[PDB]
C-alpha cells in the first residue's frame, strides 16, 4: 500500500491531512488502545484488597507494565498479530502476548491467569473505543473546531463596519455588516462546541452480558459493581451500569449528532462565503497591487467533505443503536470507520482554514451595492411613521416604493410631505443605505 | 375533508391518536401563537418606561387583550384567514385583525401604529413556533415518554427475578433475567429524555436582518437589546442575540436529535420484544385459562411509526440549517411539518404502551431453554480456575465444550478432576442455568 | 377534522393541492382498491373452466358486481368500517360486505363461500397498493412531471438566443444562452419521467406464505400459477412469483428511487432559478410599464417540499426491503405514507409550474454582465493559436490576463501580436463575449 | 502508510479483501484514466479530415501512443505528480507530461499544441470517472454479486425440499421449504443485477461551459458535436449532448441507487439467515462428526458493511445532482470517494459468499418445530370445505384452534364432524406439517 494506491482519499489524496487520528483510529490504535485496557485492569485488581490473590505491585512491576505501553510500537503491534493466529477473538491476541510479556518479571511471572480475569472480549473493545473517541476529540477535533471558530472571529472582528446589503430571498434588503454575519457562524458554533467538549464518552465493564457473572462465580465477595465502576471513572469515562454485551452506543449517536450540527453550520458557511466570493465582496490577498479574484475552491473542497462526514455520522447514530438482543456483532465492522467520518471533518476543516486566510475585503464591491438599492430605507420611514401614530405608514411606503425607483432625491421629496417632527425628518434625510446597520457593529464588539 | 379521505393518516387512519398535537401544530395553532405573540410585543411597549408613546395598560385594556387570547377559535381564525386576501405575508393579516379589535377598546382604539412595531414577518413566526415546540414538548411528548418509561419499568421490575437465557450473535449465552434486559432500555432513555425536558427552546425577536435597524432608526435612545431579550426570555425561551431574519435553527436540530436518539431506543425495544414474543417468553395476558400468543402488531406498528419519524426528524436536522446568506424562505414549508415528526412519534408511543399492556410472562419457555444450554456455565468454571492459578482454563474448557453436548454430569465429572478447593468444587456443583444469573436481580432492584 | 386543525399540511394547508391524490391514496382509495381486487379475484374463479364449483357469470351478475365498484361511496365505505368491529383483519371486513351484497342476487347468493378464497390478507393488500401506486403514476404523478418539462422547455425555448454569462464557482465564465441553460435540465428529466412511465409495478398473489398452499389442498388439479399470473398480469401489474407473504416491495423503492432522481433535478432547478432572480436576470412579467422584481417564493416552496418527499421515499426504499423471515408487519403502517410522499412532490411541482410563469427575462441585466466581462474570451483567443502550433497558447493568456483588466481595446492589441493569419486576426476581433455562445442556441433548437 | 496505520478499514484492516477495486478506483487509476482520455482524444483529431493541421498517425505513432497506456507505472504517475507542482489543475499535469512524451517520435513532436485541444478540465475527468465507473462494474461489482446469486442458488437448489415452518410476525406459520426462501432472495436480485449490468455511464466533452465554444472558434467548420459524440461512443460510454460544466452526475445517481437496491436485498438475506442460525436450522458445515453451531459472523460482517455502503451511495446521489448554476466544484472531492462506496459492497459480499460455505442443514431442527405446530393444517381443513361451498369454515377453524391445544388426534376427529365428501375427509386426514409445503419445491426447480 502507497498513498498513490490507497482507494480511500483519507489515506490517500489526502493522507497528509489527515496523520493527526491516526494514534486514535486505526488497527495500530485499536491494538494500543486494547493493551493499554487490559494492563489497566489488571493494575485495578493488584490494587484491589478484597482480591488478595493478585499481590499489590512493587516500583519494578508498575514501571514493566508502564513500559509496555510507552514502548508500544510497530514491531510490538506485528507481534499481537502474530497471536491473532491461534485465536477467535483479536482480543484474545493481546491476553497472549502479555502472557509472554509478564515471563519477563519475576513478580508478573506468576500471576498470569489474571490477565482478562472475569472479562468478556467487549469489555475490552468498548473501553478501548471509548478512550479512541475521548482522546481523539480532546486532543485533536475539539481543538481544529476551536481554531476553525477564531478564524471566522478573526474576520468577523476585523470587518466589525464594513457596511453591507443584505439579501433575503436572494434580493436587496436592510443593511448589515460583513463582520456581523461572519460572527453569527461563530455565535451558533458556540453551544455545540461546548457539548463536544463537555460529554464524557460512555463505558461498560461487567461481563459476558452485562452482570458480572463469572466475577460473581469466583468472587462472590468483591463490590464488583463498585470496583468496576471506580475502574471505567479513573479513566475519565462515563460508566454504564445497566448494559448487554456491548455498551448500546447511545453515546457515540450523541457524539456522531454533535459532529452533524457543527458540520452543518460549517456547511452553512462555506456555501455563504462562496456567494460572497461570487458577488465580488471578497478579493485574493496575496499586478502585486492589482486586484484579483479569490478561487473558492477551499469552500468547495470543505462543502463536499462535511457532507460525506454527515453520511457516515448520521449512519452511526441510527445504525449502532440496535442489536438485536443481548448483542448481534454487525456493530463491531461499522465501528471501525468512526476515524473515516471524523477525518472527512478534519479534512474539511483544513479546508476552511487555509480558504478564510485567502479573503480580502473589497469595499467598493460593497459600497456599489449599497449605493444602488436605497429601498432598503423605506421601512426606517415607516416605523419612524408608526412612533408618531402616522396610520397606513406600511401602505404608503409600499405605494412609494412600487411605484418609482427609489434614490436620495424621491425619498427626501416623501419625507417632507409627511407629518412628523421637523427634527424627525431632518433625521430620516440624513439617511444612507451605509449608515442603516442597526446595532451590526455594536453586535460584532460585544461579541466574544 | 374527512378523515376518510385524508391523504395522510397523522389525520386519517389515526386522527384519535394524534388530536393532542392540533393545538400545536396545525393552522388553527400557528394563528394562534401569532396572535398571543403580537399580543405579548405590544404588551412590552406599554410596559416599556423609555417607549412614552404607548401609555400603560389599565385593567381594561389588558382584560380585553387577555379576552383575545382565551377566547380565540374557529370563528376569529376565519377572520384572520379573511385579512390574508389583501397581505403578501400571513403574519400581516393577524396585525389588520388586531388594528380592527383594537377598536372596540378606548385606550387601544388609538395605539394602532404600534401594533407589530419595527418587526419583521419572521420575528413574529420564530416565537411562534418556538412556543408551539416547547408546549408540544412540554404538554404531549415529554410526559408520553415519561409514560413508556414507566411502563417499561413496571415490566422490569416485576420480571427481576425471572431467570432467562441469554443470545449473543444468535446464540445460547451467560443468563440474565427478563427484568433486567427490560431495565436497560429505561437506562438507555434517561439521559435523551431529560436532555428533551431541559433544552430552552431558541428564539429571536431584533427585525428584517438581525440588528434592530427600524427600532434604531425610530428610538435610538431605547435598549432594544435588552426590552427584546428581556421579552423573549419572558415567555420561557432561549434568546438568541445574533441571527439574520431567521433564528437559525439549530435548536430545531438539536431536538430532532435527542427525538432521534428516543426513537432508536424504542424501535431496538420493538425488535427485541418481538424476538421476545417469537421465541415464546411472553404469551397473552387477558380457554381462559389456556395459554394463547400474543400477536406483536403493536410493536410492529411502533416500528413502522418510529422510523418514518426518525426519516423526517433527520431531514428537519439537516436542511433547516443551512439558509441562503440572510436566508431563503425555503424553510418557511418545512416547518409546518414539524407536527407530523412528533406525530409519528406519538402513534409509536401509544403503540409501545398498548403491545406493552399484552405481555405476560411465560416461565416454562424461558425455563426449556435455560435448562438445555448448561454450556453456558462454561465461563463460570474457567474464572474460578484462574482464582486459583489454573494455567490454561479457557482452552481446557473449549476442549471440553467441543467435544461432548455438555450438562449436569459432565460438568460434574469435569469439576472434580480440577485441582481447586474442595469447598470451591462444591460451590461449582450446585450451579445451573437458572441460578447462573450473576448481579441482573440486583440491579433491577437498585435501578430507578 | 378541518383542514384548519390538520396537523399535515397535505391535509391541511395545502389541502386543495393536493386532493388530486385522494382517490388513490387515504383510507377511502384503499377500501375502494380492496373491494375491487376482491371482486376481480372472485370473477377469475368463475372465469376458470377447472374450477366449475363456481360457475360462469351471467349478464345480470356480471352487471351487480360492476355496479359494486363503480357505485362505491363514503355510504358504502361506512358499512365496511362498520364490520371491522368484528375482525382482527381490515381486509375481512371487505368479505363481509361482499358475503352480505351477494345475497341480492340469486346467483351470486350461492357463490359466497369462494369470495376471498384461498387468499390471505396480504395477496388483497399487495395488489390494492400496486393498482393504487400505477394509477397515481399514471394519472396523476406523471402527467404533472410531463407538465413541468414543457413549462421549462417552453421558457428554453423563448430564450435560445438570449446570451449570458456563465459562472463555474461563482466566477464570470465562457457564455452560454439563458435558453441552452434551461434545456439541460429537461434533457435531465426525459430519463427518469420515461423510466416512471414504464415500470410496472409489481403484485403478488400466491396465499400466505407464497407457496399456494391453501389453493392446492383443495385444488390440486388446477394450475394456480398460471391462474395466478393471468389475473394479476390482466390488472396491467408486474407478477412476482417468487415471495413470502409480502410482495417484497423492491419496485416500491425503484419507484422511490426514480421519484428522488426526478425530485433532485427540480432541486438543482429551484436554487438556480432562485440564484438568477437574485442576479435580476428575471423579473416579474405582469408601473404598468416599469420593471419590479419577481418574488422567488414559488421556487422556496417546492425546494423545501422536494426535500420532504426525497425524505420519505428514501425511507421507503431502505426500510420496506427488509422484512423478518416470512415478514414482519411493521411494512403495514409504512404503506399507509405512500401518498404523502406523492404529495408533497405534487406540491412542489404545482409551485415550480406556478413560478415559471411569473418570469420575465430582463436583457439589460444579461448584457451588462456579459460587457463587464471580456476575460471570458480568452480561452478563443488560446484555442485558434493552438490550431496555429502556437506553442505556450495557455500561458500567454494567463499573463495577459493576469496582469491587466481585460476590455476590448488591450484584447485587439494582443490578437494583433500574435502569429497567425491575417483572417484569423480579423474573426478574433470581430468576437464579443455576447457573441461567444458557441452551439448553445444550436443545441436549444435540436432539443426535444 | 501501511496497513496497520490507515485510518480507513478500506485500506487497512480490509486491505486484502479491496485491491481489485484500486485499478480503478486511487490516485494512479485515475492518473491512469485521464492519461487515456487524452491520448484518445488527440487520437480521435488525428482520425478527423476535416481537422487536417493533425496528420493521420503512422504505425510507430500509434504504437508510441498506445505504449504510454499499456507501459503506465508508479514511476510515470509520479512523473504526472512532478508537474502538479507548476498548475492550477491537476489534469493540466497530464497534458505537461504528454508534451513532454511527445518529443520523443519524430511525428508527435510536431503536434503538441493539439494535446488537450479545446478540452476543459473536466471534459477529461468525467470521461476518466466515467470508464472508472463502466469498467469497476464490468470487472469486479458485476461478477462478484454474479457469484453471490449463484451460492445463494446453489444453496436454494440443495435444500429445495427441507420443509420448514414458517414465521410471519415471529410466529408459526404455514410451511414452505428452505431451498423456497433462499431462491426468494436470488429472485429478488434478478431485475436490479441486470440493471446494473445494461446501465451505459453517462459522459460528456463539449469544453468550458457545454456549448464546444472553443471548438467553434477555432473550426467553425467542423461538426463538433457529431465528432464529439463519435469519440464518447467508441469508449462504450453514454453520451450527454446537453450539460454545463460537468456532466449532472444523475447516472451516478442511478447506478448508486442500484446498487443500494442490491445491498438491501443482501441486508435482508444477512439478518434471516442469522436468524435461521439463531433457530438452529443450519450448523457448521467442516467431535468430525458431532454437530456443532456455525457462528454468524461472516453475515453481521456483511450487514455492517452494506450499510455503511448505502450511506455513502444515498449521499452521492442526493449531492452530486445539485451544482451550483454552471456548476461548483464541491463534488471534486466527493467523486474520489465512489471507490470507497463500493469498497464496502465488495467486502460485504465476500463476507456473505465465506459465510455460505459454511453452512449445513439441521433437518431435525426443522423437524422439531414443524412437528410441534399442527395448527398450520387449518388453511387447508378452511379452504376444503370453501370447495364444497361450507359456510362458516373460517370461524369454525378459529374456533377450533383457540380453544384447544391442536395435534393429528383433535384434527381428525374435527375432519370427520365435518359435512364433506369422503374422498376429501381422507386426503386432509393424510395431511402433515411436513406435507403442507404447497408448490415451494416445485418453484424451487423451475427457478433460474
Known amino acids: 500500500l502507497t498513498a498513490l494506491n490507497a482507494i480511500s482519499p483519507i489515506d490517500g489524496r489526502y493522507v497528509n491531512k489527515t496523520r493527526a487520528l491516526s494514534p486514535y483510529f486505526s488497527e495500530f490504535a485499536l491494538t494500543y488502545y486494547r493493551?493499554?485496557?487490559?494492563?489497566?485492569?489488571?493494575?485495578?485488581?493488584?490494587?484491589?484488597?478484597?482480591?488478595?490473590?493478585?499481590?499489590?505491585?512493587?516500583?519494578?512491576?508498575?514501571?514493566?507494565?508502564?513500559?509496555?505501553?510507552?514502548?508500544?510500537?510497530?514491531?510490538?503491534?506485528?507481534?499481537?498479530?502474530?497471536?491473532?493466529?491461534?485465536?477467535?477473538?483479536?482480543?484474545?491476541?493481546?491476553?497472549?502476548?502479555?502472557?509472554?510479556?509478564?515471563?519477563?518479571?519475576?513478580?508478573?511471572k506468576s500471576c498470569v491467569a489474571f490477565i482478562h480475569f472475569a472479562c468478556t472480549s467487549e469489555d475490552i473493545n468498548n473501553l478501548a473505543y471509548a478512550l479512541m473517541i475521548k482522546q481523539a476529540i480532546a486532543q485533536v477535533i475539539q481543538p481544529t473546531i476551536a481554531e476553525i471558530m477564531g478564524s471566522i472571529t478573526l474576520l468577523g472582528k476585523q470587518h466589525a463596519d464594513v457596511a453591507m446589503l443584505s439579501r433575503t430571498h436572494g434580493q436587496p434588503a436592510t443593511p448589515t455588516t460583513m463582520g456581523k454575519e461572519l460572527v453569527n457562524f461563530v455565535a451558533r458554533l458556540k453551544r455545540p462546541q461546548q457539548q463536544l467538549a463537555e460529554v464524557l464518552i460512555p463505558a461498560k465493564f461487567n461481563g459476558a452480558v452485562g452482570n458480572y457473572n463469572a466475577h460473581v462465580a469466583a468472587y462472590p465477595e468483591?463490590?464488583?459493581?463498585?470496583?468496576?465502576?471506580?475502574?471505567?471513572?479513573?479513566?475519565?469515562?462515563?460508566?454504564?451500569?445497566?448494559?448487554?454485551?456491548?455498551?448500546?452506543h447511545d453515546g457515540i449517536a450523541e457524539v456522531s449528532q454533535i459532529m452533524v450540527r457543527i458540520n452543518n453550520i460549517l456547511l452553512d458557511y462555506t456555501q455563504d462565503i462562496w456567494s460572497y466570493i461570487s458577488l465580488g465582496y471578497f478579493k485574493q490577498k496575496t499586478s502585486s497591487t492589482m486586484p484579483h479574484k479569490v478561487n473558492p475552491i477551499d469552500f468547495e473542497n470543505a462543502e463536499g467533505n462535511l457532507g460525506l462526514s454527515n453520511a457516515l455520522f448520521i449512519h452511526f447514530a441510527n445504525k449502532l443503536t440496535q442489536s438485536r438482543m443481548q448483542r448481534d456483532l454487525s456493530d463491531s465492522t461499522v465501528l471501525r470507520n468512526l476515524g473515516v467520518a471524523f477525518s472527512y471533518s478534519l479534512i474539511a476543516y483544513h479546508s476552511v482554514a487555509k480558504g478564510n486566510d485567502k479573503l480580502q475585503i473589497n469595499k467598493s464591491a460593497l459600497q456599489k451595492d449599497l449605493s444602488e438599492n436605497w429601498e432598503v430605507l423605506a421601512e426606517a420611514i415607516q416605523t419612524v411613521m408608526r412612533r408618531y401614530n402616522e396610520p397606513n405608514a406600511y401602505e404608503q411606503l409600499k405605494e412609494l416604493t412600487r411605484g418609482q425607483m427609489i434614490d436620495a432625491e424621491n425619498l427626501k421629496k416623501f419625507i417632507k410631505t409627511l407629518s412628523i417632527p421637523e427634527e424627525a425628518k431632518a433625521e430620516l434625510m440624513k439617511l444612507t443605505p451605509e449608515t442603516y446597520t442597526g446595532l451590526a457593529t455594536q453586535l460584532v464588539k460585544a461579541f466574544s
Request: charged residues 30%; negative net charge.
Open 35 to 108: 493493551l493499554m485496557v487490559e494492563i489497566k485492569w489488571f493494575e485495578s485488581l493488584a490494587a484491589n484488597d478484597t482480591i488478595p490473590e493478585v499481590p499489590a505491585l512493587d516500583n519494578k512491576a508498575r514501571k514493566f507494565l508502564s513500559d509496555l505501553i510507552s514502548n508500544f510500537n510497530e514491531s510490538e503491534a506485528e507481534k499481537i498479530k502474530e497471536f491473532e493466529k491461534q485465536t477467535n477473538h483479536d482480543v484474545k491476541a493481546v491476553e497472549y502476548y502479555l502472557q509472554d510479556k509478564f515471563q519477563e518479571n519475576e513478580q508478573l
Open 222 to 248: 468483591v463490590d464488583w459493581r463498585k470496583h468496576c465502576a471506580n475502574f471505567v471513572t479513573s479513566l475519565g469515562l462515563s460508566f454504564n451500569a445497566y448494559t448487554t454485551q456491548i455498551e448500546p
